[PDB]
Amino acid sequence: MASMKKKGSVVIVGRINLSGDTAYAQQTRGEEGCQETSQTGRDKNQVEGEVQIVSTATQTFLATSINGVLWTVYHGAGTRTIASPKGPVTQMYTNVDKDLVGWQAPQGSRSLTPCTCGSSDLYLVTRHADVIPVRRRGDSRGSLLSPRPISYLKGSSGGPLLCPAGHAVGIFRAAVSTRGVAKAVAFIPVESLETTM
Ligand SMILES: CC[C@H](C)[C@H](NC(C)=O)C(=O)N[C@H]1CCCCC/C=C\[C@@H]2C[C@@]2(C(=O)NS(=O)(=O)C2(C)CC2)NC(=O)[C@@H]2C[C@@H](Oc3nc4cc(OC)ccc4nc3C)CN2C1=O
Ligand SMILES: [Zn+2]
């Protein structure tokens, strides 16, 4: 009982910059700072952008702000708090049935707008700042126009699927793997987010 440890907070360690004409990943915190911040839950770094790169002590993935909520996957964050300037912040959404969690969007972040376009021509943003065209195939699935090994998608859960106009259509959740090649992806649709809200 005196032995019991507590899990650290999720920590923002970077972002995917979609500011200009060229998407690129930026790192804002190194490994050691990440571990220190995960234990204290005190993150004093300025936050910017819509797509954050986040890490725990053992995993790294993405988190996306939509409608003032920073969304990510349960299989990445579990029930963890997220580090913030005033300490660990408790999740305001947790749905294991959707593989979905969410915190209040960090101060200084920018939120994506939920898509109302009804378009099936989507774009998946990875942690390496790749913008991958994806054709919507269902309420929660889409196919990569150019399949590639799952290695290229690993670590991008929690990243956004965007419509042509830049609206949020869903949160990247899983890849459908066929002999190691990712031909389709599964995502949490924004409407499922808007419902949980
Ligand atoms: C829908 C399932 C489908 C039928 C697939 N079948 C086949 C044959 O392909 C199929 O299983 N695919 C898998 C191939 C993996 C190989 C790598 C894939 C690469 C990128 C992928 C986007 C990524 C990702 O990047 N994670 S991550 O960021 O690296 C990480 C681990 C740090 C966080 N998601 C990803 O890895 C997921 C995680 C697992 O899925 C779920 N866990 C949970 C857990 C929960 O509580 C514990 C509650 C709900 C839940 N719901 C899921 C759907 C396995 N995942 C696959 O994608
Ligand atoms: Zn749209």
Side-chain angles (χ1 to χ4, degrees), residues 59-61 73-76 96 99 150 153-157 172-177 186:
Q59 291 186 124
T60 183
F61 45 101
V73 286
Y74 183 96
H75 80 262
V96 68
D99 197 18
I150 52 173
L153 305 182
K154 181 171 186 301
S156 290
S157 68
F172 186 26
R173 168 163 77 196
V176 178
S177 147

mmCIF file of all heavy atoms in Angstrom, residues 59-61 73-76 96 99 150 153-157 172-177 186, ligand 1:
data_model
loop_
_atom_site.group_PDB
_atom_site.id
_atom_site.type_symbol
_atom_site.label_atom_id
_atom_site.label_comp_id
_atom_site.label_asym_id
_atom_site.label_seq_id
_atom_site.Cartn_x
_atom_site.Cartn_y
_atom_site.Cartn_z
ATOM 1 N N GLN A 59 4.653 5.175 -24.263
ATOM 2 C CA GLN A 59 4.037 5.269 -25.579
ATOM 3 C C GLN A 59 4.025 6.718 -26.048
ATOM 4 O O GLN A 59 4.056 7.656 -25.248
ATOM 5 C CB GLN A 59 2.601 4.721 -25.568
ATOM 6 C CG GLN A 59 2.505 3.217 -25.374
ATOM 7 C CD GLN A 59 1.088 2.696 -25.525
ATOM 8 O OE1 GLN A 59 0.824 1.812 -26.341
ATOM 9 N NE2 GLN A 59 0.168 3.242 -24.741
ATOM 10 N N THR A 60 3.969 6.887 -27.369
ATOM 11 C CA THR A 60 3.841 8.201 -27.980
ATOM 12 C C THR A 60 2.816 8.116 -29.101
ATOM 13 O O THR A 60 2.772 7.131 -29.843
ATOM 14 C CB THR A 60 5.180 8.727 -28.516
ATOM 15 O OG1 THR A 60 4.996 10.051 -29.036
ATOM 16 C CG2 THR A 60 5.735 7.823 -29.610
ATOM 17 N N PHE A 61 1.983 9.146 -29.204
ATOM 18 C CA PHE A 61 0.885 9.167 -30.161
ATOM 19 C C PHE A 61 0.482 10.629 -30.355
ATOM 20 O O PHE A 61 1.242 11.539 -30.011
ATOM 21 C CB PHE A 61 -0.262 8.261 -29.678
ATOM 22 C CG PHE A 61 -0.597 8.419 -28.216
ATOM 23 C CD1 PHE A 61 -1.695 9.166 -27.822
ATOM 24 C CD2 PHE A 61 0.180 7.813 -27.239
ATOM 25 C CE1 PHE A 61 -2.005 9.314 -26.483
ATOM 26 C CE2 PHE A 61 -0.126 7.959 -25.900
ATOM 27 C CZ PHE A 61 -1.221 8.712 -25.522
ATOM 28 N N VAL A 73 -6.784 8.665 -28.161
ATOM 29 C CA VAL A 73 -7.260 7.286 -28.089
ATOM 30 C C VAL A 73 -7.081 6.754 -26.675
ATOM 31 O O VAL A 73 -6.087 7.055 -26.002
ATOM 32 C CB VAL A 73 -6.523 6.387 -29.103
ATOM 33 C CG1 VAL A 73 -7.016 6.663 -30.516
ATOM 34 C CG2 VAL A 73 -5.012 6.583 -29.007
ATOM 35 N N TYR A 74 -8.045 5.942 -26.228
ATOM 36 C CA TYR A 74 -7.943 5.315 -24.915
ATOM 37 C C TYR A 74 -6.761 4.355 -24.849
ATOM 38 O O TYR A 74 -6.082 4.269 -23.821
ATOM 39 C CB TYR A 74 -9.245 4.582 -24.584
ATOM 40 C CG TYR A 74 -9.268 3.960 -23.207
ATOM 41 C CD1 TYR A 74 -9.846 4.623 -22.134
ATOM 42 C CD2 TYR A 74 -8.716 2.705 -22.981
ATOM 43 C CE1 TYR A 74 -9.872 4.059 -20.878
ATOM 44 C CE2 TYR A 74 -8.736 2.134 -21.729
ATOM 45 C CZ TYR A 74 -9.316 2.815 -20.682
ATOM 46 O OH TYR A 74 -9.341 2.253 -19.431
ATOM 47 N N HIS A 75 -6.499 3.621 -25.933
ATOM 48 C CA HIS A 75 -5.406 2.656 -25.914
ATOM 49 C C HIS A 75 -4.040 3.326 -25.849
ATOM 50 O O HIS A 75 -3.041 2.634 -25.631
ATOM 51 C CB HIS A 75 -5.501 1.726 -27.131
ATOM 52 C CG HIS A 75 -4.963 2.305 -28.404
ATOM 53 N ND1 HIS A 75 -5.775 2.880 -29.360
ATOM 54 C CD2 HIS A 75 -3.704 2.357 -28.901
ATOM 55 C CE1 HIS A 75 -5.035 3.283 -30.379
ATOM 56 N NE2 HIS A 75 -3.775 2.975 -30.126
ATOM 57 N N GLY A 76 -3.977 4.644 -26.014
ATOM 58 C CA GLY A 76 -2.751 5.381 -25.793
ATOM 59 C C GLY A 76 -2.700 6.014 -24.416
ATOM 60 O O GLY A 76 -1.723 5.843 -23.680
ATOM 61 N N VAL A 96 -14.204 3.865 -23.475
ATOM 62 C CA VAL A 96 -13.399 2.732 -23.911
ATOM 63 C C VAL A 96 -14.074 2.002 -25.063
ATOM 64 O O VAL A 96 -13.399 1.394 -25.902
ATOM 65 C CB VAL A 96 -13.141 1.800 -22.710
ATOM 66 C CG1 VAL A 96 -14.434 1.127 -22.253
ATOM 67 C CG2 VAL A 96 -12.080 0.766 -23.050
ATOM 68 N N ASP A 99 -12.748 3.713 -27.935
ATOM 69 C CA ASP A 99 -11.301 3.944 -27.897
ATOM 70 C C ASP A 99 -11.001 5.439 -27.887
ATOM 71 O O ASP A 99 -10.097 5.915 -28.576
ATOM 72 C CB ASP A 99 -10.597 3.259 -29.071
ATOM 73 C CG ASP A 99 -9.094 3.122 -28.862
ATOM 74 O OD1 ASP A 99 -8.624 3.226 -27.706
ATOM 75 O OD2 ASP A 99 -8.377 2.910 -29.865
ATOM 76 N N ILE A 150 2.339 -0.626 -42.231
ATOM 77 C CA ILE A 150 1.768 -0.076 -41.007
ATOM 78 C C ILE A 150 2.799 0.708 -40.211
ATOM 79 O O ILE A 150 2.433 1.580 -39.416
ATOM 80 C CB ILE A 150 1.157 -1.197 -40.134
ATOM 81 C CG1 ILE A 150 2.168 -2.327 -39.914
ATOM 82 C CG2 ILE A 150 -0.114 -1.732 -40.770
ATOM 83 C CD1 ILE A 150 1.695 -3.382 -38.936
ATOM 84 N N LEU A 153 2.229 4.354 -40.112
ATOM 85 C CA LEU A 153 1.100 4.870 -39.350
ATOM 86 C C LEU A 153 1.264 4.712 -37.845
ATOM 87 O O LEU A 153 0.588 5.420 -37.091
ATOM 88 C CB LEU A 153 -0.193 4.174 -39.788
ATOM 89 C CG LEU A 153 -0.487 4.243 -41.289
ATOM 90 C CD1 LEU A 153 -1.812 3.572 -41.609
ATOM 91 C CD2 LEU A 153 -0.482 5.686 -41.776
ATOM 92 N N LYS A 154 2.130 3.806 -37.393
ATOM 93 C CA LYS A 154 2.347 3.607 -35.965
ATOM 94 C C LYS A 154 2.712 4.923 -35.291
ATOM 95 O O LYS A 154 3.576 5.665 -35.768
ATOM 96 C CB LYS A 154 3.457 2.575 -35.746
ATOM 97 C CG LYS A 154 3.746 2.266 -34.281
ATOM 98 C CD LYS A 154 4.701 1.090 -34.137
ATOM 99 C CE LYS A 154 4.873 0.676 -32.682
ATOM 100 N NZ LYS A 154 5.398 1.781 -31.830
ATOM 101 N N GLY A 155 2.045 5.207 -34.174
ATOM 102 C CA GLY A 155 2.257 6.430 -33.433
ATOM 103 C C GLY A 155 1.390 7.594 -33.853
ATOM 104 O O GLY A 155 1.557 8.695 -33.313
ATOM 105 N N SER A 156 0.467 7.392 -34.794
ATOM 106 C CA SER A 156 -0.381 8.465 -35.289
ATOM 107 C C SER A 156 -1.824 8.361 -34.816
ATOM 108 O O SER A 156 -2.642 9.209 -35.189
ATOM 109 C CB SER A 156 -0.348 8.498 -36.823
ATOM 110 O OG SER A 156 0.915 8.932 -37.294
ATOM 111 N N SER A 157 -2.169 7.354 -34.017
ATOM 112 C CA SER A 157 -3.499 7.321 -33.423
ATOM 113 C C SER A 157 -3.726 8.598 -32.627
ATOM 114 O O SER A 157 -2.813 9.112 -31.974
ATOM 115 C CB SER A 157 -3.667 6.103 -32.519
ATOM 116 O OG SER A 157 -2.857 6.214 -31.365
ATOM 117 N N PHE A 172 -8.055 9.317 -35.800
ATOM 118 C CA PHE A 172 -7.418 8.068 -36.200
ATOM 119 C C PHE A 172 -7.341 7.106 -35.020
ATOM 120 O O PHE A 172 -6.834 7.456 -33.951
ATOM 121 C CB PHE A 172 -6.019 8.365 -36.747
ATOM 122 C CG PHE A 172 -5.317 7.174 -37.332
ATOM 123 C CD1 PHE A 172 -6.030 6.101 -37.841
ATOM 124 C CD2 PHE A 172 -3.934 7.137 -37.382
ATOM 125 C CE1 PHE A 172 -5.375 5.013 -38.380
ATOM 126 C CE2 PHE A 172 -3.275 6.054 -37.924
ATOM 127 C CZ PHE A 172 -3.996 4.991 -38.425
ATOM 128 N N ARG A 173 -7.831 5.885 -35.226
ATOM 129 C CA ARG A 173 -7.969 4.900 -34.159
ATOM 130 C C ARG A 173 -7.177 3.628 -34.418
ATOM 131 O O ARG A 173 -6.456 3.158 -33.526
ATOM 132 C CB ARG A 173 -9.460 4.562 -33.971
ATOM 133 C CG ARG A 173 -9.740 3.344 -33.109
ATOM 134 C CD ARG A 173 -11.189 3.329 -32.628
ATOM 135 N NE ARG A 173 -12.127 2.904 -33.667
ATOM 136 C CZ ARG A 173 -13.443 3.098 -33.617
ATOM 137 N NH1 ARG A 173 -13.993 3.716 -32.578
ATOM 138 N NH2 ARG A 173 -14.215 2.674 -34.608
ATOM 139 N N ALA A 174 -7.291 3.047 -35.609
ATOM 140 C CA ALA A 174 -6.631 1.785 -35.900
ATOM 141 C C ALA A 174 -6.395 1.663 -37.395
ATOM 142 O O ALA A 174 -7.061 2.310 -38.207
ATOM 143 C CB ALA A 174 -7.455 0.591 -35.404
ATOM 144 N N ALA A 175 -5.434 0.816 -37.747
ATOM 145 C CA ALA A 175 -5.126 0.500 -39.133
ATOM 146 C C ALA A 175 -5.532 -0.937 -39.426
ATOM 147 O O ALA A 175 -5.298 -1.836 -38.612
ATOM 148 C CB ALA A 175 -3.635 0.687 -39.427
ATOM 149 N N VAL A 176 -6.146 -1.147 -40.585
ATOM 150 C CA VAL A 176 -6.464 -2.486 -41.063
ATOM 151 C C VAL A 176 -5.235 -2.993 -41.808
ATOM 152 O O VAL A 176 -4.853 -2.439 -42.843
ATOM 153 C CB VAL A 176 -7.709 -2.488 -41.958
ATOM 154 C CG1 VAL A 176 -7.985 -3.891 -42.475
ATOM 155 C CG2 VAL A 176 -8.908 -1.951 -41.194
ATOM 156 N N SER A 177 -4.611 -4.039 -41.278
ATOM 157 C CA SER A 177 -3.338 -4.536 -41.781
ATOM 158 C C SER A 177 -3.558 -5.826 -42.557
ATOM 159 O O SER A 177 -4.251 -6.732 -42.083
ATOM 160 C CB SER A 177 -2.357 -4.770 -40.630
ATOM 161 O OG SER A 177 -1.499 -5.866 -40.895
ATOM 162 N N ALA A 186 -9.347 2.783 -39.504
ATOM 163 C CA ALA A 186 -10.546 3.022 -38.718
ATOM 164 C C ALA A 186 -10.353 4.282 -37.885
ATOM 165 O O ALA A 186 -9.245 4.568 -37.415
ATOM 166 C CB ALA A 186 -10.862 1.831 -37.809
HETATM 167 C C1 LIG B 1 -9.973 -2.017 -35.551
HETATM 168 C C2 LIG B 1 -9.038 -3.252 -35.422
HETATM 169 C C3 LIG B 1 -8.830 -3.877 -36.822
HETATM 170 C C4 LIG B 1 -9.794 -5.056 -36.959
HETATM 171 C C5 LIG B 1 -7.385 -4.313 -37.134
HETATM 172 N N1 LIG B 1 -7.266 -5.709 -37.546
HETATM 173 C C6 LIG B 1 -6.187 -6.082 -38.479
HETATM 174 C C7 LIG B 1 -6.015 -7.549 -38.942
HETATM 175 O O1 LIG B 1 -5.445 -5.247 -38.884
HETATM 176 C C8 LIG B 1 -6.371 -4.131 -35.980
HETATM 177 O O2 LIG B 1 -6.473 -4.723 -34.950
HETATM 178 N N2 LIG B 1 -5.251 -3.178 -36.218
HETATM 179 C C9 LIG B 1 -4.236 -2.938 -35.209
HETATM 180 C C10 LIG B 1 -2.888 -3.073 -35.899
HETATM 181 C C11 LIG B 1 -1.697 -2.615 -34.981
HETATM 182 C C12 LIG B 1 -0.428 -2.517 -35.888
HETATM 183 C C13 LIG B 1 0.055 -1.039 -35.957
HETATM 184 C C14 LIG B 1 -1.007 -0.127 -36.641
HETATM 185 C C15 LIG B 1 -0.358 1.264 -36.862
HETATM 186 C C16 LIG B 1 -0.946 2.424 -36.505
HETATM 187 C C17 LIG B 1 -2.350 2.500 -35.856
HETATM 188 C C18 LIG B 1 -3.188 3.768 -35.635
HETATM 189 C C19 LIG B 1 -2.882 2.844 -34.451
HETATM 190 C C20 LIG B 1 -1.708 3.448 -33.637
HETATM 191 O O3 LIG B 1 -0.928 4.168 -34.177
HETATM 192 N N3 LIG B 1 -1.503 3.171 -32.212
HETATM 193 S S1 LIG B 1 -0.150 3.914 -31.449
HETATM 194 O O4 LIG B 1 -0.175 5.378 -31.576
HETATM 195 O O5 LIG B 1 1.105 3.574 -32.127
HETATM 196 C C21 LIG B 1 -0.119 3.388 -29.697
HETATM 197 C C22 LIG B 1 -0.121 1.884 -29.350
HETATM 198 C C23 LIG B 1 0.651 4.300 -28.742
HETATM 199 C C24 LIG B 1 -0.882 4.299 -28.731
HETATM 200 N N4 LIG B 1 -3.883 2.061 -33.697
HETATM 201 C C25 LIG B 1 -3.548 0.799 -33.000
HETATM 202 O O6 LIG B 1 -2.437 0.370 -33.003
HETATM 203 C C26 LIG B 1 -4.609 0.091 -32.416
HETATM 204 C C27 LIG B 1 -4.584 -0.291 -30.880
HETATM 205 C C28 LIG B 1 -5.205 -1.436 -30.931
HETATM 206 O O7 LIG B 1 -6.558 -1.319 -31.424
HETATM 207 C C29 LIG B 1 -7.512 -0.980 -30.419
HETATM 208 N N5 LIG B 1 -7.136 -1.020 -29.014
HETATM 209 C C30 LIG B 1 -8.136 -0.669 -27.981
HETATM 210 C C31 LIG B 1 -7.714 -0.719 -26.483
HETATM 211 C C32 LIG B 1 -8.732 -0.354 -25.391
HETATM 212 O O8 LIG B 1 -8.352 -0.399 -24.035
HETATM 213 C C33 LIG B 1 -7.093 -0.991 -23.797
HETATM 214 C C34 LIG B 1 -10.166 0.057 -25.782
HETATM 215 C C35 LIG B 1 -10.582 0.107 -27.264
HETATM 216 C C36 LIG B 1 -9.543 -0.263 -28.371
HETATM 217 N N6 LIG B 1 -9.931 -0.220 -29.805
HETATM 218 C C37 LIG B 1 -8.947 -0.567 -30.833
HETATM 219 C C38 LIG B 1 -9.345 -0.523 -32.318
HETATM 220 C C39 LIG B 1 -4.417 -2.230 -32.161
HETATM 221 N N7 LIG B 1 -4.482 -1.310 -33.138
HETATM 222 C C40 LIG B 1 -4.398 -1.511 -34.632
HETATM 223 O O9 LIG B 1 -4.454 -0.566 -35.357
#
